[PDB]
Design a protein around this ligand. Sequence first.
Ligand SMILES: O=C(O)CNC(=O)C(=O)O
Length: 371
Amino acid sequence: AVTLHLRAETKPLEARAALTPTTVKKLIAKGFKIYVEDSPQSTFNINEYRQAGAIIVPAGSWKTAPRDRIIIGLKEMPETDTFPLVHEHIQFAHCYKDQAGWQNVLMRFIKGHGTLYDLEFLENDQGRRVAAFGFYAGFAGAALGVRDWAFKQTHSDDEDLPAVSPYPNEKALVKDVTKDYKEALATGARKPTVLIIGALGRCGSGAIDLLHKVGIPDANILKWDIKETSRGGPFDEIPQADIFINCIYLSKPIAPFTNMEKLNNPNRRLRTVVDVSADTTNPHNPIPIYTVATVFNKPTVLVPTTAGPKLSVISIDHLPSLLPREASEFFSHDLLPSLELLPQRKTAPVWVRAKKLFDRHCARVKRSSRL
Ligand SMILES: O=C(O)CNC(=O)C(=O)O
């Protein structure tokens, strides 16, 4: 039987959690023992975990926990922490894609004889990820897209969409979006048309769900996926839509989805592009109309068009953080079957694959300290 210890997040403003009070309750029902660190920045109240049966402990207590506990967290630890990592850790560590400082991250595990099971690389036997955040990335992206479009109906071009902040629950977000939307319609604006590229995936499903909940008619949504995009861009449907939401990550040389030439047109209706797949490291952006990665404090950036109405991009790479509760609940539910295999981790392929991947990347690290 396994003991899990939920590490309080230390990444600034990280409000999500790898285990929710609901998943904790379910794991305890399956015979797990669960510690949960008190965390002020978590969107979950510590008392939810207490009612779920967790043992409540101070933030950072994982550092002195018995070596047999599996330390689970969502995001990175402070790069300023240097002490050896002696536990088995489950987390996103962001150190398998040659990220700055990746060798140092792994060296902490190496020195401590610890283990990293990286959440980004946990996959089923078919090679599909067991847990990610696509649905709420799309849902939050669509929400902000509608808000920006509504803002443009109700404000002058010299004003930009103000700072946004995480919401406590989905209902609260839908209410805000719907209020903005209804105020836009009051002006004489028509219900927006929305083009979604990647409509069939989790991101697309999430975007569609938000739109429906806000009251955007299904007839106003153009649902594109590979069938359509494989024709090759640029696509006229992009400037003709009121709002364009991209869910497909593309990083190879290919004809762009749109470009400044196609956007520089007085007949363009497009007001808002939400690139849910925004990645500042992407060498080949298929929507090459922005270079800034926007953020909650400054969520939109101007596309510098020479004709047509004001156009902005939302290029936030952490959209799920707009709805940290639901994002966590979905992620943790998706992860739960794998977590149930932890007693069997020495043999269960989902965990063995992740261990061997860790081993392989550690072997890439050559250091005099290891001699
Ligand atoms: O889900 C992924 O592939 C990577 N996710 C994150 O870095 C995150 O959600 O904070």
